[PDB]
Amino acid sequence: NMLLNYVPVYVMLPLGVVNVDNVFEDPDGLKEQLLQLRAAGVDGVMVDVWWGIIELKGPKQYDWRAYRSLLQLVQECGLTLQAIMSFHQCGGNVGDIVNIPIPQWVLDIGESNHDIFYTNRSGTRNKEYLTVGVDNEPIFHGRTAIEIYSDYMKSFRENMSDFLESGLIIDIEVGLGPAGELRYPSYPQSQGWEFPGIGEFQCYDKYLKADFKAAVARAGHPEWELPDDAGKYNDVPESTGFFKSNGTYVTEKGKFFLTWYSNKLLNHGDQILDEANKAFLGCKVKLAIKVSGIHWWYKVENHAAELTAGYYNLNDRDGYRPIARMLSRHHAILNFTCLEMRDSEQPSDAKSGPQELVQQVLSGGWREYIRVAGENALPRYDATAYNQIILNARPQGVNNNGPPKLSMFGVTYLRLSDDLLQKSNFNIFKKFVLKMHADQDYCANPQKYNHAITPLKPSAPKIPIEVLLEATKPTRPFPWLDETDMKVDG
């Protein structure tokens, strides 16, 4: 059945649908847009549930009223919802329309303790997220950063119990860093970074610094300090001592740091997902995390941009599969991006390989037997962009006798706007939805498109770090079609 080949499509809602003052501003306007998506056959929508909005009044003071109205509207429109536990800052750059900083009460704590933020070598503080360093430090009026995330998700599960029960919420994406992604804020625009800069390591806050010192000490190397030759945000790998050919990154010291640096993220995600599984135990939703798509420099041995972001990915070390294996014990989805990108669309000076990146990540996920979903990295309304997504949605195309050989769990389109609803753009979008649906009409029952909706089971047994890292063993990605068999056009 073409239904077994049907891949659900979701649309991210406009930023600030619920404003900084925790008010659901334009219900009438959103409902209008939502009715069109519904009519177009869209399966559901995705929304950021801003920590900076919900717990703004004070520690553990949660106001869910406005979001409940949002979810109520979405439900009445007949759409499902992917809720992001957004424990990070929205906006923050000049020009950004919607700015939603993390809770002011958390920031006030930062004023007297700057080390709660990711810090670069020069000492600049990034206030969009709390460093992994304080994940387990009870410095937030008694709670650790994780307890904060945990109480938040438990409160959400309690206050949205009706929505979770009626099946309105299909999955919970857990924010794990800047832009809600499991990574370090290595390429901040606010600090001058510009594509395709290699970015900078963000492990200099005192907690991570002490962490590293204790780690190198165990290794019997007290003389090892955090990287001091990685250069700056906009450098190219070869202009730095750490990332250049035969640079520090290949030395025993370099490899030790990178492993330590990347491991922090794996445990960061593993520990926080432990709370999500506990918080959403029994709910008929799936958990998920967002992995950033660092495609620039993917084509050179140093994978500089990837290393500074926290993904220790090399030509011979799979830096993503360990994340997929980590997600497997939580029965979580690995939500990726760059599904719409083609290598030929990036400047050569960036050694960009989004296509290859997507293939590695998706293949790794499927290799770990986990669900893999994804998003388009940049705004696109053209058929070329949609065909690339559809290609990635079913790398080996439709299967005439059974579910597709390979298939993404779902695709979340960025982003719902007036531009998207314009006649011509929307016309193409609708074809994109039809193709994602394998030429089939919107299907309400997930059972028909091989999506088993069941109660979330507790986390599987802990997987030791060495077992997670065993997934770094290089493996050829699955073969991809050159062009999809379901183009929006012919």
Scan for tokens 């857990």, then name that residue. Answer: 174
The Cα–Cα gap between 134 and 272 comes to 13
DSSP string for residues in 195-252: TT--------SHHHHHHHHHHHHHTT-TT--S-SS---TT--GGGSTTTSTT-GGGSH
Q: Label the pairing between strands 9-12 and 411-413.
A: parallel
Closest CA to 121 of 312, 260, 308: 308
Query: For the chain, what is the total number of helices (H) and then of strands (E)?
Result: 15, 10
Long-range contacts of 132-135 (CB under 8 A, 24+ apart): 132/208, 132/264, 132/265, 132/267, 132/268, 133/205, 133/206, 133/207, 133/208, 133/211, 134/207, 135/268, 135/271, 135/272
Query: 89: helix, coil or strand?
Result: coil
The Cα–Cα gap between 113 and 111 comes to 6
Q: What does R_g of the chain's alpha carbons equal in angstroms?
A: 22
Scan for tokens 């963000």, then name that residue. Answer: 202
Scan for tokens 């990154």, then name that residue. Answer: 249
The Cα–Cα gap between 252 and 433 comes to 49
**Helical H segments across 48-141, by residue range:** 51-54, 65-76, 104-112
The Cα–Cα gap between 11 and 41 comes to 11
The Cα–Cα gap between 205 and 196 comes to 25
Neighbours of 315 (CB within 10 A): 11
The Cα–Cα gap between 452 and 286 comes to 10
Residue 419 to residues 14, 15, 27, 365, Cα–Cα distance (Å): 12, 14, 19, 33
The Cα–Cα gap between 282 and 367 comes to 26
**Helical H segments across 51-205, by residue range:** 51-54, 65-76, 104-112, 145-159, 161-165
Closest CA to 468 of 343, 368, 345: 368
Closest CA to 173 of 46, 309, 258, 13: 46
Q: Are 410 and 372 spatial neighbours (Cβ–Cβ below 8 Å)?
A: no
The Cα–Cα gap between 267 and 272 comes to 8
Greatest C-alpha distance within the chain: 65
Which residue type, as a one-letter code, is found at position 66?
Answer: A
Q: Is 68 annotated as a binding residue?
A: no
The Cα–Cα gap between 5 and 286 comes to 20
Q: Is 385 annotated as a binding residue?
A: no
Long-range contacts of 215-221 (CB under 8 A, 24+ apart): 215/260, 216/256, 219/256, 221/253, 221/256
Residue 167 to residues 206, 211, 347, Cα–Cα distance (Å): 44, 42, 44
Q: Are 104 and 20 spatial neighbours (Cβ–Cβ below 8 Å)?
A: no
Find the discontinuities in the chain where C to next N exceeds 2.5 angstroms and give the residue preceding each: none
Q: Is 48 annotated as a binding residue?
A: yes
Q: What tokens were used for 247?
A: 């640079």
The Cα–Cα gap between 397 and 144 comes to 46
- Which H or E element spans position 429? helix 423-436
Q: What share of the chain is helix, strand, coil (3-state, %, to 5)?
A: 40, 10, 50
Classify residue 114 by burial, with Cβ atoms within 10 Å: 0-12, 13-18, 19+.
Answer: middle
As beta bridge partners, residue 186 has: none
Resolution given for this structure, in angstroms? 2.1
Scan for tokens 């083609």, then name that residue. Answer: 342
Q: What tokens were used for 202?
A: 């963000």
CATH number (domain holding residue 420): 3.20.20.80
DSSP string for residues in 347-408: -GGG---HHHHHHHHHHHHHHTT-EEEEE-SS---SHHHHHHHHHHHSTT---TTSS-SS--
Query: 346: helix, coil or strand?
Result: coil
Which residue type, as a one-letter code, is found at position 274?
Answer: D
Which residue type, as a one-letter code, is found at position 175?
Answer: G
Q: Is 88 annotated as a binding residue?
A: yes
Q: Are 203 and 226 spatial neighbours (Cβ–Cβ below 8 Å)?
A: yes
The Cα–Cα gap between 325 and 419 comes to 38
* Cα distance between the two ends of the chain: 21
Q: Are 348 and 358 spatial neighbours (Cβ–Cβ below 8 Å)?
A: no
Q: Are 295 and 353 spatial neighbours (Cβ–Cβ below 8 Å)?
A: yes
Q: Is 141 annotated as a binding residue?
A: no
Domain of residue 223 covers: 1-490
The Cα–Cα gap between 57 and 248 comes to 47
Closest CA to 152 of 29, 10, 53: 53
The Cα–Cα gap between 172 and 50 comes to 13
Residue 416 to residues 12, 36, 179, 459, Cα–Cα distance (Å): 6, 11, 18, 34
Q: Is 303 annotated as a binding residue?
A: no
Q: What tokens were used for 423?
A: 């006649």
Q: Report the domain count for the chain.
A: 1
Residues annotated as catalytic (active site), given as ranges: 181, 375
Residue 485 to residues 40, 105, 113, 358, 399, Cα–Cα distance (Å): 21, 52, 55, 19, 10
The Cα–Cα gap between 266 and 62 comes to 29
Residues 6+ apart with CB under 8 A from 248: 227, 229, 241, 242, 254
